[PDB]
Write a protein that binds this DNA or RNA. Structure first.
Lengths: 97, 96, 216, 87, 58, 129, 81, 25, 206, 150
RNA sequence: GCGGUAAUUCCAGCUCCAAUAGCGUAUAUUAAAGUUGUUGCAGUUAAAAAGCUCGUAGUUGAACUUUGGGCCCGGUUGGCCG
RNA sequence: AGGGGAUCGAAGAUGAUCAGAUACCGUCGUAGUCUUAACCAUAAACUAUGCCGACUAGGGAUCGGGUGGUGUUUUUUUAAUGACCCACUCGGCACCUUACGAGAAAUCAAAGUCUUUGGGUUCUGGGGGGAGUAUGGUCGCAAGGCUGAAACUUAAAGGAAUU
RNA sequence: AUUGACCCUU
């Protein structure tokens, strides 16, 4: 039967959505169906912070960060534990943790 | 709604639609096409005479086991070959 | 020895309520079958069928028995009970209790000319349970109960004499068939008719009038 | 209803909702019978004398119980400035 | 107190404690404070009460 | 688009009565609608109804009571004779003692009872009970 | 609500409703007499005027069409009819 | 057998029948 | 039908205004609530304290119409109304259910807390959905202290009051108790018997 | 609605209830009539005649101020067009679309829309030919339509 | 579905049951079949909504024109009345 | 059939893995992937939900238009406009809640107003296979598309749920 | 990283 009212994606009023490639397996998956997550990370791994700061030329350097958007196919997201299988009643929870 | 027309002058549509759809019925199609007279072995008849040819020990389906013989028969009016079952215990000795 | 624990049960034991008609009139929810058999002592209980139902476990299948019993007086009152138990005797007895608890009144009417006593139903009714839809149609006198042996017995316990039935869905499901027929006969008093259009003075409930002589 | 010679038959003529004029079933266990006391010129209500309303479980489920009771009470005159016919 | 346990002494100490009170009361009135809508509601009621009418902007 | 204005009106009445409302609005108020409502009125199934005159087609506001169980429309308006009166009134009426099949006869719009009394038949419009 | 007066609704409710959804549908628009400074020229102008209405006197474009109501000029005085 | 592969197999059978028939005729 | 002495007295109007019962729910509004009048800016609505008042008096009339004082039950699962309903049940019969309403207290006749009320007065229908849902099984009429966003389902006599405001909840419960006692006639406090009872602290919720 | 789209829009004129209107109109029926005639001679279809009348003059409806509608005035006074204005505008739109398509062969959307517009033209033409305001055997042709417009 | 060494189903004996000068079997057809559906089926997932739109035949198609008030007479009823 | 031909890459090459591995994995790589002209006419072409119309619950959000608020940013802290904020309104893509109801259920504000059965209309289905096959027709360069059986065979296939 | 299979009826 119909597992989800949304068919496991986000497409109402479109028909077609251009695909993206999974960042792990490079599988084509419609952009609305992907498990895109925005990863914003410090460059210095939060463990070399003091070492880099004390070895820097400038005092109170800003320490820029890196941004990327990771697009995930359903298989790769489940395997990498980006998402997990939930119970039937709380699959409907749209709210992020 | 409900599909079918509800016009007071739509009876031709209704009759034609029923005629078209009745062909989905197994017995109606068979009767109207005359498959009995054309391709049934008995030719539409309840009974038929024939002549016994040889010995066919049909093996039963599952879960079952019974393999002696069933008569292959050539029909008189058709010449068609037909397997027939001998319907009782030891009655194979009368249909040699 | 009954010893009820209910306002309504204590009232019925005390004898302030004499007819099941007051209970039906004031929609009091009965919960003790002693009430039902005290107000309708003449009802006959008889089982429609008993079937086995199995629940699978890591060690075999645990089998219980589900009994469908129908309680019905001579005229106007029936109830239907379905109960599953480990033993057939327990299933039968508990189904009898549930059927008594679920007793409803029947609006028996005339096909026409209102000469004798009401012999049929007042209006065409219908009940549904699962895919089974049971439709009851008033029939002229002497017609009998044109119904399958399952709901025919239920109608006989209701007290109707002449009635037609029309069944739809998979009617071999006896439980759903009997429940749909029970709904059909129940809706007869819910169908409003011109002879019922008259307004009524809205009397007081038995619990309210005899609240002083209750447990409180 | 009756038979040919009168003789009231069809046991248990039933009650109807005061707001929708529809029958209350024998096992309509969501319906209510509201009793409102009357006050006799002294700030004290008459015991044993009340105005009664039968209210259907359908109305209560739909939630129009309060509006229907307001309208009936004002119609009976025991409410003054609550319910307005012209919404 | 320990939830789940309740005895006569506990009930008595509850009533004694909620009948006893520190004597200080520092909430003396400054007279009440209603908006335009509430003030005109009281006018529609037709009562005579002392109120200060201040509109609370959106 | 709008095929049976009477069917629309009767469906609106059915919906309002089932949902429990004591009044219903009907657009656009045909003459057959007026006659049907008059028949239901004189049988006491609706109560009062008021015709609002907007210069286009008119509207009706029908004050309902709880007495209406089901009013409906038979489409198409089948040609029905005296012999078929019984067939209809048995097919689509809950009982033989109340409820009416309404039909346009050459003597105007009436129920099957008055059609029998005046010995007229015609085309079946609908029913009420 | 189960019971309400559809024949006599409140003025506020009917003003809130869409123009075609009222009991008897009526136009929410209106006519106004616009006079420009200088030439009196009391001239009736539709509120939704879809045009650059100008009086014959001089360069007196009165209203400039918009999506809904016509926007009037800067120096101009209007009176609802 | 997957329905798509059964469909492909039936297509191959159909074209082989077509070729044999065209050879015989 | 009233003897024209039950209309809103100015002192009671001051009480309600100070307790802020009139400060109803936000721009969220159930359509089954015509008690709103002149919605204030910022989105807060002003509850028409007049209709609040005669709805309270009507609920008291029903409570007085009920014969046995100890079949009526008053329910509060909210923290504000627990002591209010406890004092209500100490002032009249009106047996209390504060804290947790165990399911099957109206059904489940073998339950220790099995009550068979002829009226339930609920502090908040949303918090006490269980008591209302159980009343809908046993034919118990429902009075409820309802805001402008309250679930008016299965409640017969609403009382439009601020259920967000603890002062308003306590005041409404006190007014219910006072009016039922006055109607029953045990409270002979008409104008000036023993009189001064603004004397003590209404305000101790915890 | 929207015979040739999926739109369900309700948007139209709320004609006033009153027919003897509008109690602020001091001009005369003859003055409005000669305004109709002047605009028609200037070469304006009844749609824009009514627009400018309601819009610059005070004319709530020419129908209610006069005894009849603008197309009736024009036909009574000899100013009725050879073909009705709605069909004329449909033909003009079809000519514009076809002219666009000839250059843009690749415009499949334009081809689809031309099909729709010409279907509307043929339906309107059939109605007009039935009510006889257009002569029988009148037929819309793409080759002659551009010259027919002007 | 029965029968693989303890067969209430085979082959028999005894007993019993149904119809009975009749009973069984084969085929066809009717009811059951609301499994042909006008009454009166179904089409999200069980079979089944054309990929989508245009469009002729066909089917269907908003409201409106004379409505309402006064006197008698064949003919029916628990008939005012035994 | 021209052009284009970076990348990826049915076929193929090749290295692993493997009992085998003409598979998954790895590195290449023709056709193709892009385009012009002409064909094809299929997809789980799906919302597996035909279109037109009417009515039936509550709620918030959102997109387009409009209407009313000397409500907030600067010209101008002293009309405008804009962008926001409120209250509606019409029309969309949807969503949350509940069951008046419907349903076999999953679930559905439509899959409701359908044994209290009729608003208009088009198409389709009648147990599972054989079979989308054979044959005839027609379209296509072809691949194939549309139309489309029967003999024969079979008691289950199938749906939704429960432990 | 590899993990194929396990007769009929009951």
């Amino acid at each position: 039967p119909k597992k989800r009212a949304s068919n496991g994606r986000n497409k109402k009023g479109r028909g077609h959505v251009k695909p993206v490639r999974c960042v792990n397996c490079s599988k084509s998956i419609p952009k609305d169906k992907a498990i895109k997550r925005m990863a914003i990370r410090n460059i210095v791994e939060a463990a070399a912070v003091r070492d880099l700061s004390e070895a820097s030329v400038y005092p109170e350097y800003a320490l820029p960060k890196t941004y990327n958007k990771l697009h995930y196919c359903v298989s790769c997201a489940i395997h990498a534990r980006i998402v997990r299988v939930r119970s039937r009643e709380d699959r409907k929870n749209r709210a992020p943790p | 709604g409900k599909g079918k027309p509800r016009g007071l002058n739509s009876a031709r549509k209704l009759r034609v639609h029923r005629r078209n759809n009745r062909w989905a019925e197994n017995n109606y199609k068979k009767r109207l096409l005359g498959t009995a007279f054309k391709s049934s072995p008995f030719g539409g008849s309840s009974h038929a005479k024939g002549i016994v040819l040889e010995k066919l020990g049909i093996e039963s389906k599952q879960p079952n086991s019974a393999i002696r013989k069933c008569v292959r028969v050539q029909l008189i009016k058709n010449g068609k070959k037909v397997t027939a079952f001998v319907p009782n215990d030891g009655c194979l000795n009368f249909v040699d | 020895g009954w010893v009820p624990v209910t306002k309504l049960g204590r009232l019925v034991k005390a004898g302030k309520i004499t007819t099941i008609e007051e209970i039906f009139l004031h929609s009091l929810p009965v919960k003790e079958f002693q009430i039902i058999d005290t107000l309708l002592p003449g009802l006959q209980d008889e089982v429609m069928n008993i079937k086995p139902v199995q629940k699978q476990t890591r060690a075999g299948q645990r089998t219980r028995f589900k009994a469908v019993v129908v309680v019905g007086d001579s005229n106007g009152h029936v109830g239907l009970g379905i109960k599953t138990a480990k033993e057939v005797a327990g299933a039968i007895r508990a189904g009898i209790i549930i059927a008594k608890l679920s007793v409803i009144p029947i609006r028996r009417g005339y096909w026409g000319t209102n000469l004798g006593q009401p012999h049929s139903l007042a209006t065409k009714t219908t009940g549904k349970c699962g895919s089974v839809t049971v439709r009851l149609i008033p029939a002229p006198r002497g017609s009998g109960i044109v119904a399958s042996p399952a709901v025919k017995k239920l109608l006989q316990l209701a007290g109707v004499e002449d009635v037609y039935t029309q069944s739809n869905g998979k009617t071999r499901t006896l439980e759903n068939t009997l429940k749909a027929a029970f709904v059909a006969i129940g809706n007869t008093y819910g169908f409003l008719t011109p002879n019922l259009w008259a307004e009524q003075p809205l009397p007081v409930s038995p619990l309210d009038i005899y609240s002083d002589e209750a447990s409180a | 209803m009756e038979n040919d010679k009168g003789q009231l038959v069809e046991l248990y003529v039933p009650r109807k909702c005061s707001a929708t004029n529809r029958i209350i079933k024998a096992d309509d266990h969501a319906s209510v019978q509201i009793n409102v006391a009357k006050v006799d010129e002294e700030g004290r209500a008459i015991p044993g004398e009340y105005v009664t309303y039968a209210l259907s479980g359908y109305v209560r489920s739909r939630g129009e119980s309060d509006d229907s009771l307001n309208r009936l009470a004002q119609n009976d005159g025991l409410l003054k400035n609550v319910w307005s016919y012209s919404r | 107190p320990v939830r789940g346990i309740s005895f006569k002494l506990q009930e008595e100490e509850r009533e004694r404690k909620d009948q006893y009170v520190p004597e200080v009361s520092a909430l003396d009135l400054s007279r009440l404070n209603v908006d335009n809508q509430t003030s005109d509601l009281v006018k529609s009621l037709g009562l005579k009460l002392p109120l200060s009418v201040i509109n609370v902007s959106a | 688009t709008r095929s049976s204005v009477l069917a629309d009106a009767l469906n609106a009445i059915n919906n309002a009565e089932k949902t429990g409302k004591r009044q219903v609005l009907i657009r656009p108020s045909s003459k057959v609608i007026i006659k049907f409502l008059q028949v239901m009125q004189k049988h006491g199934y609706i109560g009062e109804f008021e015709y609002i005159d907007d210069h286009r087609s008119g509207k009706i506001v029908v004050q309902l009571n709880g007495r209406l169980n089901k009013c409906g429309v038979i489409s198409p308006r089948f040609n029905v004779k005296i012999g078929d009166i019984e067939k209809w009134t048995a097919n689509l009426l809950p009982a033989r003692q109340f409820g009416y099949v309404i039909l346009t006869t050459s003597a105007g719009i009436m129920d099957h009872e008055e059609a029998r009394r005046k010995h007229v038949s015609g085309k079946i419009l609908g029913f009420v009970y | 609500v189960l019971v309400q007066d559809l024949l006599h609704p409140t003025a506020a409710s009917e003003a809130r409703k869409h123009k075609l959804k009222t009991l008897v549908q009526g136009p929410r628009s209106y006519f106004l007499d616009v006079k420009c400074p200088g030439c009196l020229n009391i001239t009736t102008v539709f509120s939704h005027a879809q045009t650059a209405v100008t009086c014959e006197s001089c360069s007196t474009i009165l209203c400039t069409p918009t999506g809904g109501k016509a926007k009037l000029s800067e120096g101009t005085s209007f009176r609802r009819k | 057998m997957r329905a798509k592969w059964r469909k492909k197999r039936t297509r191959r059978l159909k074209r082989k029948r077509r070729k044999v028939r065209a050879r015989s005729k | 039908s009233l003897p024209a002495t039950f209309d809103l007295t100015p002192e009671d109007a001051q009480l309600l205004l100070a307790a802020n019962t009139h400060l109803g729910a936000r721009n969220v509004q159930v359509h089954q609530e015509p008690y709103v009048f002149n919605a204030r800016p910022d989105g807060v609505h002003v509850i028409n304290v007049g209709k609040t008042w005669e709805k309270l008096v009507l609920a008291a009339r029903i409570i007085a119409a009920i014969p046995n004082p100890e079949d009526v039950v008053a329910i509060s699962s909210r923290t504000f109304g627990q002591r209010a309903v406890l004092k209500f049940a100490a002032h009249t019969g009106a047996t209390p259910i504060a804290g947790r309403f165990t399911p099957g207290s109206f059904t489940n006749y073998i339950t220790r807390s099995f009550k068979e009320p002829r009226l339930v007065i609920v502090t908040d229908p949303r918090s006490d959905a269980q008591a209302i849902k159980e009343a809908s099984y046993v034919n118990i009429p429902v009075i409820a202290l309802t805001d402008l966003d309250s679930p008016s389902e299965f409640v017969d006599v609403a009382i439009p009051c601020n259920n967000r405001g603890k002062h308003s909840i306590g005041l409404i419960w006190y007014l219910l108790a006072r009016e039922v006692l006055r109607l029953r006639g045990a409270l002979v406090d008409r104008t000036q018997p023993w009189s001064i009872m603004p004397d003590l602290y209404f305000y101790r919720d915890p | 609605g929207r015979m040739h789209s999926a739109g369900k829009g309700i948007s139209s004129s709320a004609i006033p209830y009153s027919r003897n209107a509008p109690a602020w109109f001091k001009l005369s029926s003859e003055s409005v009539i000669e305004q109709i005639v002047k605009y028609a001679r200037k070469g304006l279809t009844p749609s824009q005649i009514g627009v400018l009348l309601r819009d610059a003059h005070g004319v709530t409806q020419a129908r209610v101020i006069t005894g009849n509608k603008i197309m009736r005035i024009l036909k009574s006074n000899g100013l009725a067009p050879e073909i009705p204005e709605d069909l004329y505008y449909l033909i003009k739109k079809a000519v514009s679309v076809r002219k666009h398509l000839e250059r843009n062969r690749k415009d499949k959307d334009a081809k689809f829309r031309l099909i729709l517009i010409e279907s509307r033209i043929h339906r309107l033409a059939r109605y007009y030919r039935t009510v006889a305001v257009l002569p029988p055997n009148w037929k819309y042709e793409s080759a002659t339509a551009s010259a027919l417009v002007n």
